[PDB]
């Protein structure tokens, strides 16, 4: 059988439950992952100095304490001043000791006091994705040199990697292996300028971040392995806690959205919970995650389960009306009138009518009217956007009559009266515009217009046009 809810259950039924300590173990793997990505940030000085310039934007009254970061390990603005002043002293004493191994412990201490700061995920993920873009440009240059030389000139990748991976900076791979007189060294002589230029752009990327790609590759593969560890841990916890999503989403099934839609919105909420979970508060995962799952499911039912999308607070008002009219129906007995809902609630009872009106789901246009024939509701809905053909006959006869009457005028009067209104042309024209048409006075056009209408109001011209006004 197809029944893809059951195929979902059998696809998740192989994943077994967690003990109460395995959740802490997965959370510690998550801690190890974020630890390794923040230590991968800790070696990269350009992200450091970027956040230092953003903190100078904080100190220039263009930012806020709640923009850059949030919180410290023992959020006060005087605390921000003193901790970033110690940071300031640290990075003015740290960077200028390259003049190598003397500076490395200083950079590690600057890295530790950088790790003492609790970031906003905006700036953090910005630094992560900027490192990713830098790595992608480096890989683009590497694959560019490979696609220049390796596949076309039939150079082996082992002899490519040999003096490239290991130095990667200078012309020890490039200029020496030409001079070493290999059978592939000749084929470089058509491509030596582009390979050398890509090598100098690799050196340029090194000079931007200060260190070589020999360090940068290990930095971001450390970042990649730490983030892959974290993502595998979070996959494992989500695969475990699918059951909670099912047990919550059993309740909201008949509220208009399908069952699997509910459990998928619950799984999005569960992934948000695994994002924002903190075990050191000591609560179980269930108590924390249940609110996120119910929040995502309730927000989704309020968002996308209606044809006309009615907003969140409006649906809260509708659910209050149904709850209070459920309570009052067993108090009074008949059903509550909205006059009782005036004093029962805080709304002025004329808005309660329109809230009661908006909350109606539209009828299906194939909802059958009685006796179950081919007569559905769709065959009865009249079209009100057409015009009746008698109105088209009136419009045709009116154009004919007005053309015959405007033929009876002079040349200038008929031309002005056609130009002024929408008669058998494009857009109408106003006073100054007709004045620029005929190079004639504005007020003279009004006088000609009044004389033309005065000519048309008299009988033997007014009869056939007064016939088009019915009494």
């Amino acid at each position: 059988t197809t029944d893809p809810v059951r195929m979902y259950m059998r696809e998740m039924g192989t994943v077994e439950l967690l003990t109460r300590e395995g959740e802490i173990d997965i959370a510690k793997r998550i801690e190890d992952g974020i630890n390794q990505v923040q230590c991968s940030v800790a070696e990269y000085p350009e992200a450091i100095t970027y956040l230092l310039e953003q903190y100078d934007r904080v100190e220039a009254e263009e930012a806020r304490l709640s923009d850059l970061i949030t919180g410290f390990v023992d959020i006060d603005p005087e605390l921000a001043r003193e901790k970033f002043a110690e940071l300031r002293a640290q990075y003015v004493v740290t960077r200028d000791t390259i003049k190598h191994a003397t500076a490395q412990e200083e950079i590690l201490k600057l890295s530790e006091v950088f790790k003492q700061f609790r970031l906003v995920p905006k700036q953090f993920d910005y630094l992560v994705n900027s490192m990713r873009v830098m790595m992608d440009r480096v890989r683009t240059q590497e694959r560019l040199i490979m696609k220049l030389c390796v596949e076309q000139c039939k150079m082996p990748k082992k002899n490519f990697i040999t003096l490239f991976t290991g130095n990667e900076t200078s012309d020890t791979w490039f200029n020496a292996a030409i001079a070493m007189n290999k059978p592939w060294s000749e084929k470089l002589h058509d491509v030596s300028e582009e390979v050398h230029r890509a090598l100098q752009k690799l050196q340029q990327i090194e000079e931007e971040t200060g260190l070589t790609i020999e360090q940068v590759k290990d930095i971001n593969r450390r970042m990649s392995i730490g983030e892959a560890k974290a993502r595998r841990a979070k996959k494992e916890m989500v695969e475990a806690n699918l059951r909670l999503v099912i047990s919550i989403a059993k309740k909201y099934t008949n509220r208009g959205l399908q069952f699997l839609d509910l459990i998928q919105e619950g799984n999005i909420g569960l992934m948000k919970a695994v994002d924002k979970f903190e075990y050191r508060r000591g609560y179980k995962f269930s108590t924390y995650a249940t609110w996120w799952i119910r929040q995502a499911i309730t927000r989704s039912i309020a968002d996308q389960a209606r044809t006309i999308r009615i907003p969140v607070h409006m649906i809260e008002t509708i659910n209050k009306l149904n709850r209070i009219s459920r309570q009052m129906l067993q108090e009074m007995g008949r059903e509550p009138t909205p006059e009782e809902l005036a004093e029962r609630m805080l709304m002025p009872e004329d808005k309660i009518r329109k809230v009661l009106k908006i909350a109606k789901e539209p009828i299906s246009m194939e909802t059958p009217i009685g006796d179950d024939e081919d007569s559905h509701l769709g065959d009865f809905i009249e079209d009100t956007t057409l015009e009746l053909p008698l109105d088209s006959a009136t419009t045709e006869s009116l154009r004919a009559a007005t053309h015959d009457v405007l033929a009876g005028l002079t040349a200038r009067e008929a031309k002005v009266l056609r130009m002024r209104f929408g008669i058998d042309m494009n857009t109408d024209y106003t006073l100054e515009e007709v004045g620029k048409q005929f190079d004639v006075t504005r007020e003279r056009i009004r006088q000609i217009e009044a004389k033309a209408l005065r000519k048309l109001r008299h009988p033997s011209r007014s009869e056939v046009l007064r016939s088009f006004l019915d009494d």
Binding site: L398, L417, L453, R457, R466
Partner: protein, 50 residues
């Protein structure tokens, strides 16, 4: 339209802000009005015949 707007301009008759959607007798019957009821929502002004 065009010349309908021309005609309105000529005779100055305001196209009214309202439309006759009155209840009418169906096409081709007769007879006597024997009973009239007026149901009105509470909170709305009842007119004279109500």
């Amino acid at each position: 339209t065009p010349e309908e707007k021309l005609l309105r301009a000529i005779f100055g008759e305001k196209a009214s802000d309202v439309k006759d959607s009155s209840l009418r007798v169906p096409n081709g019957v007769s007879g006597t009005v024997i009973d009239v009821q007026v149901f009105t929502r509470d909170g709305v002004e009842k007119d004279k015949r109500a």
